[PDB]
Subunit: 279 residues, 6 copies
């Protein structure tokens, strides 16, 4: 398979400059009416799950003929500070939609509302019914990858064949998830990309669609990305450090993780701090 | 009055078998899309309120020419672990409707949402307006039984006659409550009966209507019931022990009781654990 | 400007009588289906913000050629026990609408829901867009009074002129806020006025509109008011003392203040205690 | 054993009318406020609202035995939830309004509610506790041990002993554990108020301890639905449900009754918490 | 009484501009961080944002008296809610950043906020507290006792005494309670930082105690809207509202200001809580 | 320095199959329940799930060095969040199931999780802590000090000293701090159970301390993905992720793993909290 540029050196913005940029980001969150986050494997490295195209990334290790390292199971992985921050942004109405490429299930398990998430590449923990299209979010990883049969049957009242939701190398993106994602991206005045290299054809382009009709793009990545030149702001730092500085400037706590929890529909919005004066 | 079979010996399932059955129940809660609970006086014995047809039950004591025992007032009675568990099941979306024969007011006082409860036999604590059909949930028991005048007047803007809601021996069941209850029972793939003997004509039949079109019935009672042969699972144990084991297997806390609280309309659903893999 | 009667002596109801009246008020809250609060500067004196027409009030001090005293900034002012009590009344459904003359921003900052508040005289902390009528709730006081330009521009996607929302001496009342307020007052069976003298022409009359078609008026003020003769109950005491006694009789806690928080839309109602028996 | 003296059983119940009841609970609040040293004495009446029948009440174990009937249990000892009264006493210890607690119940619900073991004397023992014959070390288990009358359970001591574990349930001829009796006698002796909840006070050492408070000026309060052995020695008798009494009392004191996290053992009392200031009295 | 020395009243207020204000609150944070022993001294200025007028401020009791006017109260002593400043000091004690607290206020709001009585010296007394003439025992009441100048209230001691209860409000000629002064003098003497909030420091023993910190190297900080007696002895003077200053300070320290559960007395300090690690300084 | 003995690096990992894994975590729960004195020994394996690479694991610093590669950090030491394992150990101290904690990590996450410093021995030091050469006083900072090998940071002591502040990071030839080693040796000596999480036990004083538990009857448990120096001395070896093991263990114990409020220092352990009653064993 065509696996794109792997193992680029990383960039570390100096602290003075890094604080300047997170204040810029905060201003843009404040200035905007419609914010989408797009997330990749990078938001999960700090919970012990390796990325694909970083120094110790799955593709990168393969090329040096090495195995990537897991410091946790998918089951025992805890959502990062960045995961819980996105939960809080959605709950106070500063985050309209969230689009993720990750198959690791941590967005859902963090208690992010499923009706505001597009899982572009699917979910280790989710089976679909080949007959009635019903989704089961399970407590362990299903067992298969590539939309093959798990050997469990639908229970609605059906007995249809349940399959995995992990695309293989030629599978089309789920249409509902891709549709919602394209809508959210097109109709945004701010897209922010966290821990994605933006190299995958459909998924990595959607942030650019925010730039059509005047909208700002922000990119938060340790490595260069495919679209660095299209950004209004590029932040080279650990997303956790970036996201904790950001919540602090927004006057928002990062909520505790109750443990693995599914929320299907978003709850009505909670109160948030008032906006600073700007310009 | 025709008062049915009273004082049957009780059954105690051995522990090994009891744990096997509560795992069966949990599987059925997991497998189902539409769960109704039906509750009788048995869920209230552990808060000091005696049942009707048990060893020390009101009807049973009468026959041996004895008085039944109250270890609490209706006012000072605290909802049981089983009451608070049903509150939590509704709040995480594992319980669609609840149908109760009890007049003791503990469902409402536990903070169960009234728009998801049918009080088939009425409520010590509730007056209705004979004119505009408005319901007042009071902090003490009204004073009368049999739909007679309390001597308090409606306050909407009416001055109509407020009466008790406790049926006497020939009164028809409230039509709205009976209607909602029959709907919830018919359109369920799982009914579970807790602390009811199922001997009363309209009320005790509704669980059977779940069995039409493929639906499962579960019965949790210390004594035999009228419908033991129709069940898919029979659990002979204390509902509190059963319900605490069940919540544990579902990965759900039993909430604290804030004290006496009326919730008219159900709130949108809270997150719940993901489902195990089954078969 | 015509500034009305200033500096009247205050009245202090004796304790026996004061407790009798707060029990009367509580009965009326219990008896009613539709309660509006109207609030003036008096609910803010206990957080260090002086009133207009009291002994040490802005107008009153001017006449004796004195400056009124601020013991806090608008920014550092904390909502009073009366503010947080009104938050709790709205959240348990005992308060339908709230109408305030205060420009101090404490209702909004207490986390009262904006869709249930009419700010009749505007808000130090709020800018409006002269073009698209969009409102920005800021974290500091805007800088101008009298609907003049702040020198900040709209950010929707507009670049329109943002102005203050503080009426000057001839400006018409905001039409949406006045409209909602007149509706809420007309269709109420109980209006309660807290810390207002009711001297301002549109604002001070709205409580009277509750008295049309049988509705009760209650007035809580240390000084005489314009409309004392129209009231069913007059309570001469500190609103904080009155409101804490009231919540106690209603069996309701006064919530902690999380700090400055904007809630745009009201959340669905929380459970409340059941009603006593009355007459 | 069989011929043992089981006392007066099944006496009629008394119900103070609502008026006389509120005035009495207000009077108790006053005695708590006025007192520098409050001991509580509890019996099986604090456990009936959690599904456990008493001994000498209308459906009490002894009372049903005399009529040839069986007491009814509405739960196991394991699934039993501490009452409003149990949780209210945890709080009174946590704000310093309760010096000591002396109970005759073996149901374990005091310990399971999180009451600190160093401020409680379990006069008749505890179904959940086994001792070591050698070590004298106490294990608090998540289930009932199996035996009564201080017999070997089948488990051994795990200090590093391998000594014999035994139940703590006294039999008819068995003396009281000397440590619990001694602390209970001291706490009762130097109390300026004893309040007895759900006990009829017929058992010889246990039922007399509140009288030791009445020597040297101390006040005694008896809350019970039936007459009790010492009704004549009381300064205040309250005929009502201990839950109603304790919920009113706490309300007068301005204290909230704590949630029960589930079965939880606390060996040693934590330092005191803030409590409301005292009303002005006379 | 009438002729008594009431000091300089109604001085003009000073307002540090926003810039100079943030730099000064950052400088205070640094002094807290650097110091192993922080005492606070409070006066009536911490109580004005809760509706209680001061003595020597523009609308202060003495200041209005001199012009022939009356001070205004925006609440009773009973309905008065502790300020952001009161609750912030509770927290600083709970994380170990405050060794002792020395207040001249008689409004009781320190005690009512849950500040532990063993780490606070009530130099001028407390409206809510009566002593026993005989016992010397202190009762903290839910309402103001009635009298000032150490006169009998009409209540008697309830230790088991029947001794005379008296107010603790000092009069003009009355000495300071020796215990509170002694602890305040010790805490001030061995402090390496004293911070004074809302006091003008004119009263002779009370106002001098922060200077005792300045002997043997100690730093003194004065936060006050008006000049104060000792402005010249300070290492840092902050002209702003004590609430704004304390809310900024806590934010710099990474501490949250606690909710007030309502009127609550705590006799003895609880053990310390975790607090954020220190910034690197110079 | 360069030639130093770095031990066996990059050994293969072992994965106990699910069945054998649950039976082993149940067996550990039993050993905790049976034991009166539990010490934990932690190494860099408890920090890998928070983005910090270990030393001798497959991508461990030493292991990558040997292959000519660089270890990867998924966060700074400052933005690093304590793991499920870190927070689970805080709780076990708070309910009295953990007597002492002995760690070889310099990452500071134990202290930052709110683990009380008086029940923990930081054998190899702490990036966030500077000592005073003169005072021997320790400052816990909000950022990493700058240096390793006990060299001057550039800051001075603020006790009132002006002494030299130094890092606490041991170098290759540096002895262990005598106080931490002494407490660790005592706690290990008198423990009836040692449990080692994420250490390969190759460092000479630190790795041997769990063996001191095995003298005079004590049980030793090793939880580690790779073989360790002392695998043969263990009574129980668990090959799995320390998070999975600790989350199962806590569930068996009926304890919840606490939220992390953010970076918070606690000098002295608080008194114990209630914990569930013990299961009946054999
Ligand atoms: N803590 C961190 N902070 C910031 N950036 C980080 C961090 N850790 C890693 N990164 C950066 O995070 C970036 C991760 O980029 P890639 O590894 O390509 O992941 P994707 O989500 O874009 O891959 C998309 C799909 O391709 C796959 O085949 C699967 O199908 C995926 O679903 C790097 O550039 C790191 O520098
Ligand atoms: N803790 C317990 N766990 C399980 N079962 C229990 C428990 N306690 C009691 N039971 C069982 O609980 C069952 C209770 O059954 P019945 O007493 O007939 O009550 P109903 O609600 O069905 O009576 C319906 C109406 O009839 C009346 O006239 C009123 O009008 C009622 O509204 C017994 O079989 C006990 O074994
Ligand atoms: N703690 C207290 N408790 C009760 N009453 C109080 C308290 N404190 C003060 N009061 C009473 O509170 C009353 C305050 O009345 P006014 O001062 O006229 O304020 P408004 O809101 O009615 O003025 C309306 C507009 O007029 C202005 O020009 C602005 O445009 C305002 O928006 C007094 O009668 C006090 O006795
Ligand atoms: N809800 C209630 N509220 C108040 N009182 C109650 C309640 N329920 C019951 N009572 C009263 O509670 C009282 C309980 O009286 P007894 O049953 O003799 O209990 P003991 O603890 O004194 O028995 C001591 C020993 O006797 C044995 O030999 C064992 O060794 C026991 O340990 C009754 O008078 C009820 O009226
Ligand atoms: N919000 C505020 N922020 C800051 N400072 C304030 C504030 N409000 C007022 N102030 C200042 O707070 C200061 C208060 O000064 P004084 O009123 O003399 O109070 P004391 O506590 O020193 O009086 C001591 C004794 O005097 C009597 O005889 C009694 O016995 C008293 O106990 C002023 O300078 C205000 O500028
Ligand atoms: N998630 C995990 N679960 C369980 N074990 C793990 C995990 N991740 C890693 N491990 C294991 O964790 C183990 C860590 O072994 P080492 O890296 O030698 O750490 P130390 O603390 O013993 O090094 C001591 C000193 O050595 C230096 O010189 C410094 O001075 C250090 O302080 C491996 O065996 C992994 O298999
Ligand atoms: O602790 C004693 O009983 C246990 C506690 C208890 C209670 O608190 C309330 C109640 O309604 C019943 C009740 O039965 C319990 C019990 C204990 C046993 O050891 C036992 O064999 C049994 O069948 C049942 C006990 C003590 C005694 O001294 C005694 O003589 C006796 O017969 C029993
Ligand atoms: O404690 C003293 O006053 C009380 C506290 C207080 C305050 O904190 C702020 C304020 O704005 C006013 C204020 O009045 C209070 C007060 C106390 C009385 O005893 C009293 O008779 C009264 O009318 C009112 C006091 C002490 C004094 O030494 C004194 O000389 C005096 O006149 C009064
Ligand atoms: O504390 C030591 O390192 C720090 C802690 C640490 C860790 O916990 C896990 C990890 O994956 C890497 C790691 O690097 C840290 C570090 C410390 C330094 O002082 C330093 O100069 C550096 O580059 C990086 C240390 C101790 C040593 O004894 C030693 O010999 C050494 O080289 C380093
Ligand atoms: Zn299907
Ligand atoms: Zn009607
Ligand atoms: Zn606009
Ligand atoms: Zn032993
Ligand atoms: Zn005395
Ligand atoms: Zn030093």
């Amino acid at each position: 398979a065509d696996k794109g540029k792997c193992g680029l050196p990383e960039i570390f913005d100096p602290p003075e400059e890094l604080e300047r940029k997170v204040w810029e980001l905060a201003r843009l969150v404040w200035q905007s009416s419609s914010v989408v986050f797009h997330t990749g494997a990078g938001i999960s490295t700090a919970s012990g799950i390796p990325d694909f195209r970083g120094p110790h990334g799955v593709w990168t290790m393969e090329e040096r003929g090495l195995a990537p390292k897991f410091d946790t199971t998918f089951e025992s992985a805890r959502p990062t500070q960045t995961h819980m921050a996105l939960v809080q942004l959605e709950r106070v109405g500063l985050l309209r939609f969230l689009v993720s490429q990750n198959v690791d299930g941590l967005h859902v398990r963090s208690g992010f509302p499923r009706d505001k998430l597009a899982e572009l590449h699917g979910n280790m923990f989710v089976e679909e019914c080949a007959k009635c299209k019903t989704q089961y979010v399970r407590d362990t990883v299903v067992g298969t990858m590539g939309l093959k049969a798990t050997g469990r049957l639908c229970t609605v009242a059906c007995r249809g064949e349940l399959r995995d939701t992990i695309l293989d190398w030629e599978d089309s993106l789920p249409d509902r998830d891709l549709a919602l994602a394209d809508e959210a991206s097109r109709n945004a005045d701010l897209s922010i990309t966290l821990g994605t290299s933006l190299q995958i054809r459909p998924s990595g382009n959607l942030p650019l669609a925010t730039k059509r009709r005047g909208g700002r793009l922000v990119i938060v990545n340790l490595q260069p990305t495919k679209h660095d030149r299209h950004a209004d702001l590029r932040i080279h730092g650990y997303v956790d450090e970036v996201m904790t500085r950001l919540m602090k400037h927004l006057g928002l706590e990062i909520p505790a993780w109750d443990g693995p929890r599914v929320l299907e529909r978003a709850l009505p919005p909670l109160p948030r701090p008032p906006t600073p004066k700007l310009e």
